[PDB]
Design a protein around this ligand. Structure first.
Ligand SMILES: *[C@H](N[C@@H](C)C(=O)O)c1c(COP(=O)(O)O)cnc(C)c1O
Ligand SMILES: *[C@H](N[C@@H](C)C(=O)O)c1c(COP(=O)(O)O)cnc(C)c1O
Lengths: 401, 397
């Protein structure tokens, strides 16, 4: 929408960008000043709880919290009522397992990918172990490319399919639209972990054939910490059983029992993170002013240069060689050095990078490595930063071992 | 300095008379500045990275957890961050759900906020348990002799420290001694006590304790606490698991890590925990003693002014047992209407059932209007309240 120069105009709103080269955006994003200003105005100018209390402050907070839910719903192509606020993606996913637990029978089958983050693996493991389910992993290569033929066989008799949109370890962008169409043809519930897609590329629930979808405010959306989202497609309102219950979730309560209210309030127990939802809505508004298409483009350029530069240094990097299937994340290793050491040297030069397993241990074991070092980007990162990154990589790479 | 020196830090204080503190508190500038510093100067995820931003974030996050532990007399590792009291309470029910057998007994009070009632109701329903209520009066002072009777066979006792509808301060020390004496696990809902009066887990004999940053502690929204006494680390099943929760993981198995990370699934509300820690620091600069005295002084004046006006108020007549909350009703007028006219005068009050329908149904009322305080509220505010209240009751001829 807005006429902005990328990345110069985003950088102007983010003071830390003058201090460091921030390449750890898959862990969490830097926060623009206008997102913190939107939260600061709730705290200082209209501080109150919601649930439509008659007083003016509650009226204004409530109106802002509702606005925030709608902004989020539009961003995803969802209806207002299908959006539920959690603390993070992890909560959202656990809520899907706990909320659907009751519909599984011994011998049922959950299928996922072998690349999942622990948060999109552990709930399904625990649930499988407890109810005697089968948990099967669709097959794929070491770059993260899934065998879609194997996907069709695995999904066939599946009760539920849970997949990440993008891998936080490898940067592979899975073909979630195709996987969703398969799940639909086979009558399997489809859950998408969009923790690394939201705010970096397009995420639309109807395009993705999603039944549930989860993402985290603090990542691509450029919101604060402490705010997540769980999309619950309306088809499921009659079966999903709210895992958290109490204030705000009812029509009536007596000492003998209770009656739940309509969604979305049905799923939101107690005072919500009002400030976080306002912040996330400002994050989303900020993203839409830049445009998801231009964000993707800017990340693809950074990925292209970084990658070409590491080939020149003969530094192996992971994930798909086809850049059309590679998000703004480049995991790499320097043979002869431990990832933690590479990240430490990079930190002494003011370049922030992550090292280790990335909460994706099955990725590291599949590939047969201890960790990787990971550089991740966002729209505010620059080609200039990548050049200076390559410059220190170059120096670092000198000497044997 | 009290309350002027606190009011200097809250701009809203110059725009309205905020008497809706039990719903949520107003937030002082230093709380917001602390959260802004994280977002603008050391923004990063926690867990562990070598990079400097992550070192700082990790350090401040841990520091927050310590500040919260010390606030309530706990051990660093016994503090779990959640989104609010309601999540904390639900997590207690879900993580202990496995220890009950059909016919076991859960005991609570009859004045509970829905968040400290429904999880127990649900659990009793699904497990064939006995859910029983200790008796009390309309004020609502609990019958402690009845509590002995009821806690005897109990597997778990859940009580609120203070009622958000009546303002009654329960005798939690005593109820806690009883349940310990009877071998029951004691769970305390301190949503309305944290930040308004002393809450120490040792003194309270609590096994589990819950509170909300956004209320008395003058912290932000989205940050709750659950206290888990070290005794229960091997019984309590973490209801939410994944990132930051493990030691190892493979495609068909997982090993969980140690408290408190074992109970915190995914990227935590870093900015909230840091905001909460600065609210607790702000609270301590003032002192819980002074906060409680300031609020008692407002209740006492408010209450006598409403007697003078023939406006009935609920909860304990004994002010020693009455927190900083006064629920009342104007005869001839629905509470939502009293709240509107008060709002027209820039006085913020809450009306309705306050998510405590069993309180309303025990008293035989639809709801009440609720004026609630904090340390920054003033005597001059209470007087202006009583003035519009007077005009309001006069007009009703
Ligand atoms: C977040 N992963 C990062 C913390 C990282 O790798 O550095 C993530 C989640 C969990 O999101 P939370 O907000 O709950 O921490 C889930 N799925 C994926 C793919 C990622 O990256
Ligand atoms: C919070 N009650 C207020 C919203 C009000 O009475 O208006 C409360 C809870 C729930 O805490 P949350 O932060 O989850 O909403 C639980 N117990 C009590 C006693 C209160 O007041």
């Amino acid at each position: 929408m807005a006429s902005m120069r990328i990345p110069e105009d985003v950088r102007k709103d983010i003071p830390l960008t003058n201090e460091v080269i921030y390449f750890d955006n898959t862990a969490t994003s830097l926060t623009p000043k206008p997102v913190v200003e939107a939260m600061d105005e709730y705290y200082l100018k209209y501080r109150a709880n919601v649930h439509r209390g008659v007083h003016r402050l509650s009226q204004m907070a409530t109106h802002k919290y509702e606005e925030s839910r709608k902004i989020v719903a539009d961003f995803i192509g969802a209806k207002f009522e299908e959006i539920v606020f959690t603390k993070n993606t992890s909560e959202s996913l656990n809520l899907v397992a706990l909320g659907l637990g009751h519909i599984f029978k011994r011998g049922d089958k959950i299928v996922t990918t072998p690349y999942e983050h622990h948060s999109d693996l552990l709930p399904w493991q625990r649930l499988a172990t407890k109810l005697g389910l089968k948990l099967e992993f669709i097959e794929g290569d070491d770059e993260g490319n899934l065998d879609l033929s194997d996907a069709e066989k695995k999904i066939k008799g599946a009760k539920l399919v849970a997949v990440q949109h993008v891998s936080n370890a490898l940067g592979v962008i899975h073909e979630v639209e195709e996987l969703g169409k398969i799940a639909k043809d086979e009558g399997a519930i489809f859950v998408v972990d969009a923790a690394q897609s939201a705010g970096h590329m397009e995420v639309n629930v109807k395009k993705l054939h999603a039944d549930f979808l989860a993402f985290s405010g603090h990542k691509g959306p450029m919101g604060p910490t402490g705010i997540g989202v769980l999309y619950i497609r309306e088809e499921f309102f009659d079966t999903f059983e709210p895992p958290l219950i109490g204030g705000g979730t009812i029509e009536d309560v007596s000492l003998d029992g209770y009656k739940l209210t309509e969604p979305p309030e049905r799923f939101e127990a107690g005072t919500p993170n009002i400030g976080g939802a306002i912040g996330l809505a400002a994050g989303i508004r900020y993203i839409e002013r830049i445009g998801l298409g231009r964000i993707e483009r800017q990340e693809h350029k950074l990925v292209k240069r970084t990658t070409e530069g590491l080939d020149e240094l003969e530094v192996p990097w992971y994930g798909p060689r086809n850049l059309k299937k590679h998000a703004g994340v480049v995991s790499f290793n320097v043979p002869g050095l431990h990832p933690h050491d590479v990240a430490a040297i990079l930190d002494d030069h003011s370049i922030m990078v992550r090292s280790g397993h990335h909460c994706a241990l099955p990725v590291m074991k599949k590939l047969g490595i201890n960790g990787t070092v990971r550089a991740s980007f966002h729209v505010y990162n620059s080609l200039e930063e990548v050049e200076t990154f390559l410059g220190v990589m170059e120096e670092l790479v000198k000497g044997l071992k």
